[PDB]
Amino acid sequence: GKVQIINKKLDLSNVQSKCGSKDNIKHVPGGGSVQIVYKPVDLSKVTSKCGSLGNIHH
Amino acid sequence: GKVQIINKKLDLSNVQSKCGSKDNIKHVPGGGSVQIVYKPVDLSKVTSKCGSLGNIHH
Amino acid sequence: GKVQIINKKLDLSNVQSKCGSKDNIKHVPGGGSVQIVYKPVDLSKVTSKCGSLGNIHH
Amino acid sequence: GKVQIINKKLDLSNVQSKCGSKDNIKHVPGGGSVQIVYKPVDLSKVTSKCGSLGNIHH
Amino acid sequence: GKVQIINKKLDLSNVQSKCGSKDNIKHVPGGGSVQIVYKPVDLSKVTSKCGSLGNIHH
Amino acid sequence: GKVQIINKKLDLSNVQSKCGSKDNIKHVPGGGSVQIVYKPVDLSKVTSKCGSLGNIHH
Numbered sequence: 001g002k003v004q005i006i007n008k009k010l011d012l013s014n015v016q017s018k019c020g021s022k023d024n025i026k027h028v029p030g031g032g033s034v035q036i037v038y039k040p041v042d043l044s045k046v047t048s049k050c051g052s053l054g055n056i057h058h
Numbered sequence: 059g060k061v062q063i064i065n066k067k068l069d070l071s072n073v074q075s076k077c078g079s080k081d082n083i084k085h086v087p088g089g090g091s092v093q094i095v096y097k098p099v100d101l102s103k104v105t106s107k108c109g110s111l112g113n114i115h116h
Numbered sequence: 117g118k119v120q121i122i123n124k125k126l127d128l129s130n131v132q133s134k135c136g137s138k139d140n141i142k143h144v145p146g147g148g149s150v151q152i153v154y155k156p157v158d159l160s161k162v163t164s165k166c167g168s169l170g171n172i173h174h
Numbered sequence: 175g176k177v178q179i180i181n182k183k184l185d186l187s188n189v190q191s192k193c194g195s196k197d198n199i200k201h202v203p204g205g206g207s208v209q210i211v212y213k214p215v216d217l218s219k220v221t222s223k224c225g226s227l228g229n230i231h232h
Numbered sequence: 233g234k235v236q237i238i239n240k241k242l243d244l245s246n247v248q249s250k251c252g253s254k255d256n257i258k259h260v261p262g263g264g265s266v267q268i269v270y271k272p273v274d275l276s277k278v279t280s281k282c283g284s285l286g287n288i289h290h
Numbered sequence: 291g292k293v294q295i296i297n298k299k300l301d302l303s304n305v306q307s308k309c310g311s312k313d314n315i316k317h318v319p320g321g322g323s324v325q326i327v328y329k330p331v332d333l334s335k336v337t338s339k340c341g342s343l344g345n346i347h348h
C-alpha cells in the first residue's frame with residue numbers, strides 16, 4: 001500500500017559529552033554552553049486525492 | 059493500506075552527559091547551561107479526499 | 117486501513133546526567149541550569165473527507 | 175479502520191540525574207535549576223466528514 | 233472502526249533524581265529547584281460529521 | 291466503533307527522588323523546591339454530528 005513520510009528535524013546527539021573517561025584533572029574554571037533559537041515558519045500544504053472519475057466535458 | 063506520517067521534532071540526546079566515568083577532579087568552579095527558545099509558527103494545511111466520482115459537466 | 121500520524125515534539129533526553137560514575141571530587145562550586153521558553157503558535161488545519169459522490173453539473 | 179493521531183509534546187527525561195553512582199565528594203556548594211515557561215497558543219482546526227453523497231447541481 | 237487521538241503534554245521524568253547510589257559526601261550546602269509556569273491558551277476546534285446525504289441543488 | 295480521546299496533561303514523575311540509596315552523608319544544609327503556576331485558559335469547542343440526511347434545496 002501507499003506509504004508517505006515527511007520529516008523536519010533538529011537533532012543534537014553526543015554534544016559536549018564524555019564516555020569511558022579515566023582522566024585526572026585539577027582545576028576546571030570554565031564549562032560549556034548550548035544556545036538554540038528555534039523559530040521556524042511552516043506554511044506547507046499536503047494534499048491527497050484518491051478515487052476513480054468518469055466523464056468531464058465542462 | 060495508506061499510511062501517512064509527518065514529524066517536526068527538536069531532539070537533544072546525550073548533551074553534557076557522562077557515562078562510565080572513573081575520573082579524579084579537585085576543583086570545578088563552573089558548570090554547563092542549556093538555553094532553548096522554542097517559538098515556531100505553524101500554518102500548514104493537510105487535506106485528504108477519498109471516494110469515487112461520476113460525471114462533471116459544469 | 118488508513119493511518120495518519122502528526123508529531124510536533126520537544127524532547128530532551130540525558131541532559132547533564134551521569135551513568136556508571138566512579139569518580140572522586142573535592143570541591144564543586146557551580147552547577148548546571150536548564151532554561152526553556154516554550155511559546156509556539158499553531159494555526160494548522162487538518163481535513164479529511166471520505167465518501168463516494170455522483171454527478172455534479174453546477 | 176481509520177486511525178488518526180496528533181501529538182504536541184514537551185518531554186524532559188533524565189535531566190540532571192544520576193544512575194549507578196559510586197563516587198566520593200567532599201563539598202558541593204551549588205546545585206542545578208530547571209526553569210520552564212510554557213505559554214503556547216493553539217488555534218488549530220480538525221475536521222472529519224464521512225458519508226456518501228448523491229447529486230449536486232447548485 | 234475510527235480511532236482519533238489528540239495529545240498535548242508536558243512531561244518531566246527523572247529530573248534531579250538518583251538511582252542505585254552508593255556515594256559518600258561530607259557537605260552539601262545547596263540543592264536543586266524546579267520552576268514551571270504553565271499558561272497555555274487553547275482555542276482549537278474539533279468537528280466530526282458522519283452520515284449519508286442525498287441531493288443538493290441550492 | 292468510534293473512539294475519541296483528548297489529553298491535556300502536566301505530569302511530573304520521579305523529580306528529586308531517590309531509589310536504592312546506600313549513601314553516607316554528614317551535613318545537608320539545603321534542600322529542593324518545586325514551584326508550579328498552573329493558569330491555563332481553555333476555550334476549545336468539540337462537536338460531533340451523526341445521522342443520515344435527505345434532500346436540501348435551500
Ligand SMILES: Cc1ccc2nc(-c3ccc(/N=N/c4c(S(=O)(=O)O)cc5cc(S(=O)(=O)O)ccc5c4O)cc3)sc2c1
Pocket residue numbers: 016017018031032074075076088089090091132133134147148149190191192205206248249250263264306307
Ligand atoms: C537528589 C538530587 C538532586 C540534584 C542532583 N543533580 C545531579 C547531577 C549529576 C551529574 C551532573 N553532570 N554534569 C556535567 C556537566 S554540567 O551541565 O552540570 O556543567 C558538563 C559536562 C561536560 C563534559 S565535556 O564537554 O568536558 O566532555 C563531560 C561531562 C559533564 C557533566 O557530567 C550534573 C548534576 S544528581 C542529583 C540528585
Ligand SMILES: Cc1ccc2nc(-c3ccc(/N=N/c4c(S(=O)(=O)O)cc5cc(S(=O)(=O)O)ccc5c4O)cc3)sc2c1
Pocket residue numbers: 085143201259317
Ligand atoms: C590556583 C588556586 C588558588 C587558590 C585556591 N583555593 C582553593 C580552595 C578549595 C576548597 C576550600 N574549602 N574551604 C572550606 C572552608 S574556608 O577555609 O575556605 O573558610 C570552611 C569550611 C567549613 C565547614 S563546617 O565547619 O560548616 O563543617 C565545611 C567545609 C569548609 C570548606 O570546604 C577553600 C579554598 S582551590 C585553589 C586554586
Ligand SMILES: Cc1ccc2nc(-c3ccc(/N=N/c4c(S(=O)(=O)O)cc5cc(S(=O)(=O)O)ccc5c4O)cc3)sc2c1
Pocket residue numbers: 035036093094095151152153209210211267268269325326327
Ligand atoms: C539565548 C537565551 C538567553 C537568556 C534566556 N533566559 C531564559 C529564562 C527562562 C526561564 C526563567 N524563569 N524565571 C522564574 C523566576 S525569575 O526570578 O528568574 O524571573 C521566578 C519564578 C517564581 C515562581 S513562584 O515563587 O511564584 O512559585 C515560579 C517560577 C519562576 C520562574 O520560572 C528565567 C529566564 S531562557 C534564555 C535563552
